[PDB]
């Protein structure tokens, strides 16, 4: 019991002092390369130094996983024994502290690699050398996400094992709460390494002369942005299974509402981290549009940033769909009309989050195009930017509709189980408001898009381009009116469900 609770306690301490030595050997490793870069008078030699230095950091990241995986595998073993639920919780808190250490050590590795790339950029005179540096840094940061998610997948595995042994309810809520906070902590570690790597691409831009490399730094920025977004999506998928497994061993209804309530909060941090990395991506594009002197390059930047924004709305949508099936699952294990009414609210709260998240994506692609207009000269290239823009807007309506239909699908299940009359009435109340909040976003998006076509029409002369820009304005109002219709039809389908299920 305590003779093996003390054992894992001593295993975590050494694993944390190995991590403390892990990035210690990395800080010394970076300073050496910085000393060599400072003195090495070369250009193919600045790259070979950064290359093998980035590779040493990638290996040290794979080392931290070899420690954490062997350490987590041991914690699982000590859970196989131990009868006391009062001492599984001890073992569960020890695993959370361990994974928070590996992720802190992983962030510290990327920060040291972040320094090395900047040292490689000063001692690099050619544009071709700068771009090969950033392409090597994106390689390191992409393995930092992969190791960060691996630590998360192995922690939520430790939680799953401790849940099967858990007999008491309050022990389960603690296990769930402890491992949700780690997914949240890991979500912010991923956002930290994104902002760092994005600011390096900025300093890489400020050293570039040609317009060719500026496009290659935007492509390299778009690569990391999808990498950061899918890395957060995997985190969301990790907390989903932990939420489902925490419910299979959940005692009663109050424990399941609280498990879903904690689940929603994680899905929030995923939306707020997704938003923050999309804004960061747009600034790098804005820093790259300001310096671009050619329209053949300006178009390629906005088009790449809009693909990111579109893919952001789709990952915003999957995280919603992940959290919505889980809410449906929780309703299946609820016997109280009070705890099923409190599962519809937390669903309608996760819906308002995805829409405010969708809007912030839209607002980001707005100022992206706005900067593209100013960096564009000629009515033709201006219209194509608006074209690529309302494409983003059309995928904001569709993702909004899908967000509402997912919520109505959840209301349809809570209704079928709500055997009480005021519950049927309450579920319908809090549901139609998300449709009013949906049409409110659909109008906010349109106003935003309305300012942009007016902006484009001002910097336009060639009458034909005005006809093209007029066909897009008609296109945009068309898509948001359809989206407005597909939202009323959802509330109409749902208003005829409190009718059936109630007297």
Numbering used by the authors: 1 to 503
What text comes from the article?
Here we describe extendable linear, curved and angled protein building blocks, as well as inter-block interactions, that conform to specified geometric standards; assemblies designed using these blocks inherit their extendability and regular interaction surfaces, enabling them to be expanded or contracted by varying the number of modules, and reinforced with secondary struts. Restricting helical geometry to ideal straight helices with zero helical twist in principle considerably limits what types of structure could be built, but this is more than compensated by the great simplification of downstream material design, as illustrated below.
To generate straight, linear THRs, we set Δθ to zero. We tested 33 linear THRs (with Δh = 0) with helices either about 20 or about 40 residues in height; 23 of 33 tested designs were solubly expressed, and 13 of 19 designs analysed by SEC were primarily monomeric as designed. Structural characterization of the linear building blocks by X-ray crystallography individually and/or cryogenic EM (cryo-EM) in the context of assemblies (see below) revealed that both the detailed internal structures and the overall straight linear geometry were successfully achieved. a,b, The linear THR designs (rainbow) are nearly identical to the experimentally determined structures (grey).
